[PDB]
Write a protein that binds this DNA or RNA. Structure first.
Lengths: 168, 125, 37, 96, 103, 64
RNA sequence: GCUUAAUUUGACUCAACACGGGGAAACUCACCAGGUCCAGACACAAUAAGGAUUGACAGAUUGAGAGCUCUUUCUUGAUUUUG
């Protein structure tokens, strides 16, 4: 009550903009890139989407109601109604939002960066892409800020397609 | 009041369980006349002291103690030297055994929860 | 507050969000602001 | 940084069914529910506790996070000298 | 059996004409009294901020935007008719409210 | 002699009409706040005052 | 530029100079000549009760803001002050 009108449509975005950080900063494997908040009556259902729900389920609740005990206690939210419904997040190169997470990690565990680079490309440009875009500009064992690069395609941006093709 | 020789080795734990807790009083300037304000409550002493200055003032009421709080009366001078929290320090390998304290006033629960109820069958045998 | 990126000044006190504006350009997407004109 | 040890209930106790420490980068107000500091105590005390492991720290716009793991059975089960099946962290609640 | 009023103030205009259609759909399959979805003037938010992290360079700025649309319907029905249908028209990003103001 | 008054009105007139013969800011800065710890010079001004011959030194305390 | 008890500095052709969102006092604090208290993960150690400290002064002290001084009853209790 005593609720400001337009602020509730902007405060939730701030709430949106910070919950995603742990799905960056805590996990690496399953691909849970895109978060999705579905608010039903009196319950906030952010859908847990994990390809391997054993970090979260485990011994019947490894991190089902373990991750919630931070975040629901972080926002002074009520317990129980912090529903985190489990699902599977989508495919690795064969999705749209995962192409962030597809290449968030796929530079090597210690060999040459070209053989890192030329691996990532041949998968999805034939199997479900004509545009993706990663970032590399770094050195090779000297005192130079050299900039070698690659990408795979021209994109689709023709106007308002900057603002539905850019995403979380 | 009497004691035992077997179960008391499992009862060298009342003074021993005081190690870091910042409420401890191992002294002479507070651990001897600890029955005055009411906040000063009890004294856990032993009558085998080498200095009979202040204890013999309180020995007149120690064996007939107050009936509201424990006043543990033992005989051997070991727990004041070993089982006071500092004599035998519970360490593995590196263990600099300092000497035990003076008379030490203890009032803590924890490991002494049930052992305040097991001292009924101690002062009669 | 000083939030993050070498800023305690130029805060956006409007609309009750309180972000340092150096660290607004990279967060203005997922809030749901977008430029059009 | 002093560790004043006056009260274990306001040091480490009732997190056995919580397992989490939410906090804040703060500075001097000395009152916080659901956690063991007032506003400074467990913050500088987890600094020792992190350095024996068993709590993991994110920052995430200045809210300190902590959670327990396997190397926590060695203090809580014995400092509060309680048996098993009532303490634990991997089973923190009736369901988790 | 009381005159009610529903509001919905969302920000995905494609996902507000599906909801406002199925609101007037199941009411008219039960044929209640109603008045059409009145569409209010929308609200835009904007903030001008210059485009450099440091300060060294030429000067013109940005302009960011966010659009809020809001429309509302008045209605009257028996309560058993309405208390079920307001729970099957959920969709993410969308807000629903019920007002039974009968002063 | 502000209002043509006696300029030897030293102990006879209190602090209250001291404000009455004065301009507007201290005519507001009089009930501006009942200071206690910033009223700590006056508790220490009397700690060393008038216990001297003609022409003295007070007890100054580090303030803001 | 001068000046200074310091005038905290970044940036000098268009592409530096009403700009670093730099409209003002104590927030900012980056600076100047006073004041502070906080410096410990483990592994080292000793006074660890016959004493460090926890004394916070405990108020007149104490000259100069609660004070860092003991004149003492200590929550004393090896936390940690400590080395």
């Amino acid at each position: 009550a005593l609720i400001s009108k337009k602020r509730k449509l902007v405060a939730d975005g701030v709430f949106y903009a910070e919950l995603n950080e742990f799905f960056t900063r805590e996990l690496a494997e399953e691909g849970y890139s895109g978060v999705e908040v579905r608010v039903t009556p009196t319950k906030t259902e952010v859908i847990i989407r994990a390809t391997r729900t054993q970090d979260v389920l485990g011994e019947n609740g490894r991190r089902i109601n373990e991750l919630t005990l931070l975040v629901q206690k972080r926002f002074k939210y009520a317990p129980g109604t912090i529903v985190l419904y489990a699902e599977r997040v989508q495919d690795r190169g064969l999705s749209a939002v995962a192409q962030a997470e597809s290449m968030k990690f796929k530079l090597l565990n210690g060999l040459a960066i070209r053989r890192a680079a030329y691996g990532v490309v041949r998968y999805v440009m034939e199997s479900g892409a004509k545009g993706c875009e990663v970032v590399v500009s770094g050195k090779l064992r000297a005192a130079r800020a050299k900039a070698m690069k690659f990408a795979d395609g021209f994109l689709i941006h023709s106007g308002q397609p900057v603002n539905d093709f850019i995403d979380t | 009041q009497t004691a035992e020789v077997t179960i008391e080795d499992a009862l060298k734990v009342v003074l021993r369980t005081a190690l870091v807790h910042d409420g401890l009083a191992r002294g002479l300037r507070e651990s001897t006349k600890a029955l005055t304000r009411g906040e000063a409550l009890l004294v856990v002493l032993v009558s085998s002291v080498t200095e009979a200055n202040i204890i013999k003032l309180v020995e007149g009421l120690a064996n007939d103690p107050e009936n509201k709080v424990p006043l543990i009366k033992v005989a051997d001078a070991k727990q004041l030297g070993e089982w006071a929290g500092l004599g035998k320090i519970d360490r593995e390998g590196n263990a600099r055994k300092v000497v035990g304290a003076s008379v030490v006033v203890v009032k803590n629960w924890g490991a002494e929860t049930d052992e305040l109820s097991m001292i009924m069958e101690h002062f009669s045998q | 507050q000083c939030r993050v990126c070498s800023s305690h000044t130029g805060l956006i006190r409007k609309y009750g969000l309180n972000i340092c504006r150096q660290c607004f350009r990279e967060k203005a997407n997922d809030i749901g602001f977008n430029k059009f004109r | 940084m002093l560790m004043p040890k006056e009260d274990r209930n306001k040091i480490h106790q009732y997190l056995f069914q919580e397992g989490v420490v939410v906090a804040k980068k703060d500075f001097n107000q000395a009152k916080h529910e659901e956690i063991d500091t007032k506003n400074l105590y467990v913050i500088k005390a987890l600094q020792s506790l992190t350095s024996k492991g068993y709590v993991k720290t994110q920052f995430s716009w200045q809210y300190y996070y902590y959670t327990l793991t396997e190397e926590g059975v060695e203090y809580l089960r014995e400092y509060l000298n309680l048996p098993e099946h009532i303490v634990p962290g991997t089973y923190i609640q009736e369901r988790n | 059996i009381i005159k009610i009023r529903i509001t919905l103030t969302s920000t995905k205009v494609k996902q507000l004409e599906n909801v406002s259609s199925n609101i007037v759909k199941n009411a008219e399959q039960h044929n209640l009294v109603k008045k059409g979805p009145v569409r209010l003037p929308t609200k835009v938010l904007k903030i001008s901020t210059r485009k450099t992290p440091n300060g060294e360079g030429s000067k013109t700025w940005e302009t960011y935007e966010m659009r809020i649309h809001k429309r509302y319907i008045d209605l009257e029905a028996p309560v058993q008719i309405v208390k079920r249908i307001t729970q099957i028209t959920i969709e993410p990003g969308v807000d629903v409210e019920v007002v039974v103001a009968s002063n | 002699s502000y209002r043509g008054v006696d300029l030897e009105k030293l102990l006879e007139m209190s602090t209250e009409d001291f404000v009455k013969l004065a301009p507007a800011r201290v005519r507001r800065r009089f009930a501006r706040g009942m200071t206690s710890k910033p009223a700590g010079f006056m508790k220490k001004l009397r700690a060393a005052k008038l216990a001297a011959p003609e022409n003295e030194k007070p007890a100054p305390v580090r303030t803001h």
